[PDB]
Ligand binder design. Structure first.
Ligand code: HAS
Ligand code: HEM
Ligand SMILES: CCCCCCCCCO[C@@H]1O[C@H](CO)[C@@H](O)[C@H](O)[C@H]1O
Ligand SMILES: CCCCCCCCCO[C@@H]1O[C@H](CO)[C@@H](O)[C@H](O)[C@H]1O
Ligand SMILES: CCCCCCCCCO[C@@H]1O[C@H](CO)[C@@H](O)[C@H](O)[C@H]1O
Ligand SMILES: CCCCCCCCCO[C@@H]1O[C@H](CO)[C@@H](O)[C@H](O)[C@H]1O
Ligand code: CUA
Ligand SMILES: [Cu+]
Lengths: 166, 33, 557
């Protein structure tokens, strides 16, 4: 009792740390599950795709809004998205429902975010580098793109639209 | 005395909060997937 | 001489009082933008009113930076430099080198000063993360760098005192507070490498003219090498106070020396190699290296789950000792009329949901739900601005007596409680509104009040954010009229003021000794700390440092 107190209490320390490690690993488990499913598609790609942000809206696939969506499989689209000081090229992004969409996004100025309301598309856009995520919209409608990385005073106004065709 | 049971009810609330948050956010993640 | 000769028998008090006053001063100025930012997330625009009161201010986002830098970089470090030096020296009744010590306070005062000026004059509106390629005045980074370099001196000072007590005391195991402070200061050196490279290798030359651009991926990867454990550099001063000072204010004992020690050794191994939990949604970083940092962050939570049990048991024991009634009897026996006790206890409670938010954040793919929304500021307001800050606030009531011999009156004690309870109740209400607003997709870092029609699903959590701006306005104002009323009063009754820091007796035990002996194998674990940083950041930094792709700086404000 004040030293018996000790002997107990330090055994609990052991049981709480055991339980804790257990629960923690179950979490590691259920993350693991997600990386194996389709949902893992939102994770940005490893490979360093270098581009030159000063040249990007002149030459390459980010130079022409008309050419942003480019069929890349029987059920696949690559979208070249430009995130810039203070909206999105193209606008809207029209994509068919059911299809794998491969967003390839970059910026000509400062870092942006490209986050799509109601999806787990949530990525940082860095000048000089291509952010590559994939997604399949399971139902049609308009999806608002919010820019969630501070980039200057137009920040609170940077929104885009994705139209996913019926 | 014996059992530090006040401290157990503390770590119990802590465990539950941890599970409501992680399970709630897991469910949202799937629903947007 | 010196007639509060206080400062020539125990001069360390003179320097600690300095840090502290400076720390809390940055915190009054920083927090002034708080409620303004709160009513904004409530969808009221009080900025034209602010810009009245403070004509120098040009945008919501200048606010945000001052708030950030002033509250989270400057208030917290200066609070760590105080606590983490003064406590070690006092538990070891020894002099910190008042030469090296007085230096650090001046490296910080120059530092803060040089930085403040471009900030105040709208030249460095890049926020507390200052992400390239956004470009600030040379003054900001030069300031920042030298301010952050104040800690390195602090490092040496504590290590100094450590080395001298050992020689005078050979065979003797390292005493508790000191051991803490020793690994703390060690962590922070290892951790601070990231920010230090990023400044020297990139930020400094760039903002001077010496080069043309920076690679934004490397910049952000060095930043977050530092940027995570810097949160643990804020947390552990409070933890040090909470482990070894608060059970005494509670009327109790620290139930365990080892556990306190095992906690802090753990923060030394795992605080630094976890930085990619901040980068889950970056391009060009391998998914496999996100999972490992994921796993590793989840391990960093473990010393803190432990803490929860040790502290809970210490407060329980003390409770019982004061006739602490039944299953919950013990809670009502604790000293609820001492702001020294209330503050860190209320912060511990808010730390329950906050740590829970971290765990989600940490879990790789779950971060895609919440990253860069209002949830993130939801979470860390519970962590840094409730726990750490409340521990700093409620510690005005022991430390200040002990440093100046001003006693706390009884009208002041009661002011203390009205702040602490208002501060807490306002923090909790803001937590809900921002967790929820963020689960509705409302971005962080945004003048959302300017787009009032933009997030209409957020209506009621917006009612919670307004409701907290007013509550935290009152709290901040009642804190100023009282911080200054504890200081500018004309009483000094300093028997109170030599009078050792209420350090805590420890319930000793058998299974101590050989375990306390291993954890005291310091040089070994410090090196393990470096091996772990090296493996975590090694393969990725090697990759990126041979693909440097610097880009022009912009100013977009
Ligand atoms: C001072 C500050 C902070 C602490 C401490 C802190 C803890 C954690 N955080 Fe965090 N955080 C993240 C994950 C964690 C994890 C795993 C922990 C762990 O260290 C938490 C472990 C904690 C616990 C498991 C709680 C234990 C509970 C205790 C100890 C209380 C018990 C109560 C008692 C004993 C009272 C009983 C008494 C009675 C009287 C009843 C992640 C992701 O993995 C992100 C990035 C996500 C994103 O999208 O950016 C992040 C973002 C932030 C940012 C934003 C950075 C920026 O500006 O971009 C800040 C400032 C911050 C602060 C802090 N954070 N965090
Ligand atoms: C005084 C009461 C306070 C209020 C009403 C308040 C309110 C807020 C709000 C509503 C935001 C989010 C704004 C945005 O993301 O655009 C924010 C951001 C922040 N707060 Fe506070 N806060 C207070 C005190 C504190 C304290 C004491 C600290 C730290 C010691 C703190 C640290 C921060 C940091 C680091 C950020 C984000 C900076 C950034 O995103 O660049 N706050 N605050
Ligand atoms: C402290 C937390 C208080 C929590 C308040 C309730 C949280 C519910 C979040 O609603 C979310 O709304 C989105 C539509 O905008 C959908 O994407 C998603 O299916 C749904 O889950
Ligand atoms: C052999 C070269 C090593 C460099 C020497 C380090 C000392 C740096 C000067 O610091 C000064 O030390 C004094 C003595 O404590 C203080 O009184 C003084 O105010 C402080 O600024
Ligand atoms: C419980 C959550 C509700 C929020 C409002 C709580 C404020 C009440 C706390 O006041 C405390 O009351 C004690 C009497 O019990 C006194 O010992 C102590 O001097 C005083 O500070
Ligand atoms: C009229 C009193 C009878 C009802 C009893 C319920 C009291 C609710 C207090 O719990 C509070 O809930 C918040 C979330 O809502 C938490 O964030 C916070 O830590 C906690 O203090
Ligand atoms: Cu682009 Cu905010
Ligand atoms: Cu972190």
């Amino acid at each position: 009792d004040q030293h018996k107190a000790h002997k107990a209490i330090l055994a609990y320390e052991k049981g709480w740390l055991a339980f804790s490690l257990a629960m923690l690993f179950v979490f590691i488990a259920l993350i693991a599950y997600t990386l194996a499913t389709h949902t893992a598609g939102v994770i940005p790609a490893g490979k360093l795709e270098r581009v030159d942000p000063t040249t990007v809206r002149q030459e390459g696939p980010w130079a022409d809004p008309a050419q942003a969506v480019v069929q890349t499989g029987p059920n696949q689209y690559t979208v070249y998205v430009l995130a810039f000081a203070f909206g999105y090229q193209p606008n809207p992004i029209e994509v068919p429902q059911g299809a794998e969409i491969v967003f390839k996004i970059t910026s000509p100025d400062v870092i942006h975010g490209f986050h799509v309301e109601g999806t787990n598309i949530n990525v940082e856009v860095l000048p000089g580098e291509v952010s590559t995520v994939r997604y399949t919209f399971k139902r049609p409608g308009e999806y608002r793109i919010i820019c969630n990385q501070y980039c200057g005073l137009g920040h609170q106004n940077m929104f885009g639209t994705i139209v996913v065709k019926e | 005395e014996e059992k530090p049971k006040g401290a157990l009810a503390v770590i119990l609330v802590l465990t539950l909060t941890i599970l409501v948050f992680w399970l709630g956010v897991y469910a949202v993640f799937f629903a947007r997937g | 001489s010196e007639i509060s000769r206080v400062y020539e028998a125990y001069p360390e008090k003179k320097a600690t009082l300095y840090f502290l006053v400076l720390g809390f001063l940055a915190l009054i100025v920083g927090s002034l933008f708080g409620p303004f930012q709160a009513l904004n997330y409530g969808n009221v625009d009080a900025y034209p009113l602010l810009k009245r009161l403070l004509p120098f201010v040009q945008s919501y986002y200048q606010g945000l930076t001052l708030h950030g830098v002033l509250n989270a970089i400057v208030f917290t470090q200066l609070f760590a430099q105080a606590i983490m030096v003064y406590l070690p020296a006092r538990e070891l009744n020894m002099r910190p080198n008042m030469g090296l010590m007085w230096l650090s306070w001046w490296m910080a005062f120059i530092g803060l000063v040089v930085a403040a000026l471009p900030l105040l004059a709208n030249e460095a509106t890049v926020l507390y993360t200052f992400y390239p390629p956004l470009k600030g005045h040379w003054a900001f980074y030069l300031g920042a760098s030298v301010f952050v370099l104040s800690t390195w001196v602090s490092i040496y000072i504590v290590l100094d005192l450590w080395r001298r007590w050992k020689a005078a005391n050979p065979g003797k195991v390292t005493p508790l507070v000191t051991y803490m402070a020793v690994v703390f200061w060690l962590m922070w050196f290892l951790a601070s490498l990231g920010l230090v490279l990023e400044a020297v290798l990139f930020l400094l030359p760039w903002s001077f003219g010496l080069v043309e651009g920076v690679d934004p991926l490397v910049a952000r990867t060095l930043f977050w090498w530092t940027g995570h454990p810097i949160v643990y550099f804020w947390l552990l001063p409070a933890y040090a106070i909470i482990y070894t000072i608060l059970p005494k204010q509670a009327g109790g004992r620290l139930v365990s020396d080892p556990m306190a020690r095992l906690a802090f050794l753990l923060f030394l191994l795992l605080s630094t190699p976890v930085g990619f939990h901040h980068q889950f949604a970056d391009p060009g970083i391998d998914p496999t290296w996100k999972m490992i940092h994921s796993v590793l962050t989840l391990f960093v939570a473990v010393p803190s789950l432990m803490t929860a049990f040790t502290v809970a048991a210490s407060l329980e024991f003390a409770g019982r000792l004061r006739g602490g009634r039944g299953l919950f009897g013990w809670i009502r026996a604790l000293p609820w009329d001492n702001p020294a006790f209330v503050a860190p206890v209320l912060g511990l409670l808010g730390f329950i949901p906050g740590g829970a938010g971290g765990i989600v954040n940490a879990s790789f793919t779950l971060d895609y739900v919440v990253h860069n929304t209002a949830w993130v500021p939801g979470h860390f307001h519970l962590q840094v601005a409730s726990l750490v800050t409340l521990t700093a606030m409620g510690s005005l009531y022991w430390l200040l007596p002990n440093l100046t011999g001003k006693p706390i009156s009884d009208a002041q004690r009661r002011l203390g409680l009205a702040v602490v309870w208002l501060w807490f109740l306002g923090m909790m209400i803001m937590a809900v509104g921002l967790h929820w607003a963020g689960l509705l997709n409302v971005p962080r870092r945004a003048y959302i009040a300017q787009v009032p029609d933009a997030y209409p699903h957020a209506a009621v959590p917006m009612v919670f954010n307004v409701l907290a701006g007013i509550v935290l306005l009152v709290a901040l104002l009642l804190f100023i009229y009282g911080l200054f009323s504890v200081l500018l009063s004309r009483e000094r009754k300093p028997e109170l003021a030599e009078a050792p820091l209420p350090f805590a007796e420890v319930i000793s035990g058998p299974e101590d000794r050989r375990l306390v002996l291993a954890m005291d194998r310091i040089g070994f674990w410090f090196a393990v700390a470096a091996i772990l940083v090296v493996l975590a950041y090694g393969p990725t930094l090697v990759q990126l440092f041979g693909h440097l792709n610097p880009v022009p700086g912009w100013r977009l404000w």
